[PDB]
Design a protein around this ligand. Sequence first.
Ligand SMILES: [Mg+2]
Ligand SMILES: [Mg+2]
Ligand SMILES: [Mg+2]
Ligand SMILES: [Mg+2]
Ligand SMILES: [Mg+2]
Ligand SMILES: [Mg+2]
Ligand SMILES: [Mg+2]
Ligand SMILES: [Mg+2]
Ligand SMILES: [Mg+2]
Ligand SMILES: [Mg+2]
Ligand SMILES: [Mg+2]
Ligand SMILES: [Mg+2]
Ligand SMILES: [Mg+2]
Ligand SMILES: [Mg+2]
Lengths: 121, 213, 257
Amino acid sequence: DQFTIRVKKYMSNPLLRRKQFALEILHPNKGSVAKKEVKERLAKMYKLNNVNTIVLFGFKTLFGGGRTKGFGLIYKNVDAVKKFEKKYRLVREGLIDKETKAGRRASKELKNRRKKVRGTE
Amino acid sequence: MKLNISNPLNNVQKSIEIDDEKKLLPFMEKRIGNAVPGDSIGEEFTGYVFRITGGNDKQGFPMIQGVLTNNRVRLLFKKGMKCYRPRKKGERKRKSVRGCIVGQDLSALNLTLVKKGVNEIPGLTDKAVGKKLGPKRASKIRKLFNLDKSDDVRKYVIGRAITKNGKTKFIKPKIQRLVTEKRLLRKRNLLQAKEKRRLEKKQQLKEYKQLLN
Amino acid sequence: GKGIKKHLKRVNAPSHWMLNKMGGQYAPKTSSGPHKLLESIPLVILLRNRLKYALTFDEVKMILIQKIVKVDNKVRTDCTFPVGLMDVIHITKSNEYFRLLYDIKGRFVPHRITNEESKYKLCKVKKILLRKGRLSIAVTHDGRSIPYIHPDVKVNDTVRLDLETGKVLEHLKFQVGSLVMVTAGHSVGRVGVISSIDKNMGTYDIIHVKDSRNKVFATRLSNVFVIGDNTKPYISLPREKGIKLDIIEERRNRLKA
RNA sequence: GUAGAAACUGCGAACGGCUCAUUAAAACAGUUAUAGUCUACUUGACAUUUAUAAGGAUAACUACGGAAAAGCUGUAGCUAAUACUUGCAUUAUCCUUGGAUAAGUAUUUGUUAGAAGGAAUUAUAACAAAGAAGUAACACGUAGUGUGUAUCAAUCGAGUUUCUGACCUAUCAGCUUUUGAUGUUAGGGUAUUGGCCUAACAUGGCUAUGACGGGUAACGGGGAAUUAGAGUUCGAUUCCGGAGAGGGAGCCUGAGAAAUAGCUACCACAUCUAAGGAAGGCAGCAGGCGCGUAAAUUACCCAAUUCUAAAGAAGAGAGGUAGUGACAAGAAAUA
Ligand SMILES: [Mg+2]
Ligand SMILES: [Mg+2]
Ligand SMILES: [Mg+2]
Ligand SMILES: [Mg+2]
Ligand SMILES: [Mg+2]
Ligand SMILES: [Mg+2]
Ligand SMILES: [Mg+2]
Ligand SMILES: [Mg+2]
Ligand SMILES: [Mg+2]
Ligand SMILES: [Mg+2]
Ligand SMILES: [Mg+2]
Ligand SMILES: [Mg+2]
Ligand SMILES: [Mg+2]
Ligand SMILES: [Mg+2]
């Protein structure tokens, strides 16, 4: 409800298609305002017609309480987010939803297929 | 015992099982590669001539041509020989192989047809089968259909079957060494690059020679 | 087997790269090319650790896939390409130019030159060879062959090279009054002039350099790079202009609030 | 046009990981030489004695099979390639004419001349003989690239090599040399120097400043423990160098190996079997037996650090994460 945001070492990265910055969150006598409210506040700041181009990670609460630190990341459009962000991040945000679990028992199939020959292999 | 007879001209082969010493007596003590009459193994085979090309013994070890023995031996094999295939490059391995003299302890013969007789032995001599694959290099098609420089070669290839909606579609192999226009761009580009390099070297030499003074 | 090694361990990497001693057991292991391993820096280090554009190795890869990074006016896609001393770097997307230099410590920096300066560099001559037809070839510190070299060029002076065309513009001699930059032990970004040359017969030659504050230092001949005539340098320099103060007065300055 | 189980072709598997048995002027450390050599990938320069396009053959595949068994394979019938082969189209100098010709990259032999290094039998040039291998009968659609190619240079490396530097023992005082020990001459061989090897010749070489022997519960350094200053004792074990894959010897491929999750034999040990035969190497990660005073999970993952490839996208017991854990270290309740 009553929190403040301080953005530090802001940088623009045209090689990628994003902006890069560090973050500090102030919330006295309360605990750990959630990620959604932070996203909404950032969107209001940069006018950010949508909220699906923002990535946040690495949030720590600083023993004693009342403040929090982390990192942020804002992309030009959702196409860039999908293009060059890794898969686990892209699953936490919810842009995609894939959970294939082939497993590292594929090693057994790797091995016992080397002993068969051209046709049956 | 079990005999495999194949007809190279017509691409067809037939197998018979014979368990008798008398019927196989003429084959004994004959190397591989030489002809042999086939009368004794059957009434219908009168006038038929066969040729020994292979086979393997009771335990399944193959017969090889070089060795002049009646029994099994033990050699070390390389890339260029017959009954072996390397796992690595430059690997050599020692294996056991059977001689090339035909003996009573064989389990298969693997012999081909040479001459016909007076009967037809259905399923070995009457039939014939085609290539199963057509040529892909252009000059081979030119020689197959007796064409010339004028006859375009892209029309004389054979597709197989497709009956999706049209009765005939004939999807065809991609043919190689065809005279694509591109291969002419290659020649002209190479020529222009060589000429440009020649011009540059001449200019460099003239500038250097004037540069001394 | 005992052939050529391919890995590099972190605590064995050259100390001027300044790599964290935690977070890993390995270092990027620069490729073979125009510069030696110890007198160079890979492109990944430049583009992640220094400029902070990338956060991982994979992001350096996705930067270099799209062909937007040029060294010495040619696009490169090798994440471990050696980037070396006098080399200009252009990032087309951001419209930026850099030249690597030494600071007064031994660590490389990108200097942020302008566009007009981005059309040349300086190469020092390592040897001169005579080939068929009596044509001369110059070999530079940059690993580069120059044919049709001028007759008045020797095996220790420097030359100024156009980058759009590999032709020579002019050359600077190696004399008593020339301006120099030093590239090895105890003095790595120092700029002074020259005071004298020694020429010991079977062993190294020692030369002496005088600073602009009348401080004198010496080093070997093989770690001297001529960068100007008596009056002025031919390239821009970093903020300190190669002036190394000692620890007492450096500390005094740093405490001026 | 797009995708594409097999298979041929290319590259890599000589890096990484483990252990400390051997080893006492050996290995190793600081300091030198290669004017006595080899060097894939990467970088820069850059070439010489039917042509609107040449050859034949082989995988995968189909039919007929053998063996108890194995990463076994026979015969017949086709067909590709940047696999394997063959082979065409132009200029520079002698003096706004003309002929001569160069008609040959590396490398070997004989006769000469001669910008750099402290020093040349050095780059280089000429004359007379030999002569490899090459300069695109390839792929993409971005004026550009990809793959391959003769010499030189750079880079990543290695092989040899100069000087100096080690623990205890004289109940170890003379060693080496017929069978190379120390030198000279001529060759062989190697990537190059060399008794490295072969023939002829000579009698040399090391030593109480410790040779030649014995012992080590000895891999060498960077380092560790304890000490006012001197010293004494440790270093199997994060990094660097060396050596090995049960014990010895030999060998193929390749730029790089005397390689061992490459091959061939002998000694020891041991597996399957229809008894004819076929397969083997945890001092890699877990795990088991034994040994002993003496030491952990048959777990999760390629997200980070990096490496290999046809190099975003695949893989990695390298590596990271957790489980066991009063080895060792830091803070800190029981008011
Ligand atoms: Mg070894
Ligand atoms: Mg990465
Ligand atoms: Mg190793
Ligand atoms: Mg002798
Ligand atoms: Mg040690
Ligand atoms: Mg080690
Ligand atoms: Mg063992
Ligand atoms: Mg071995
Ligand atoms: Mg063995
Ligand atoms: Mg093993
Ligand atoms: Mg183990
Ligand atoms: Mg214990
Ligand atoms: Mg990775
Ligand atoms: Mg590709």
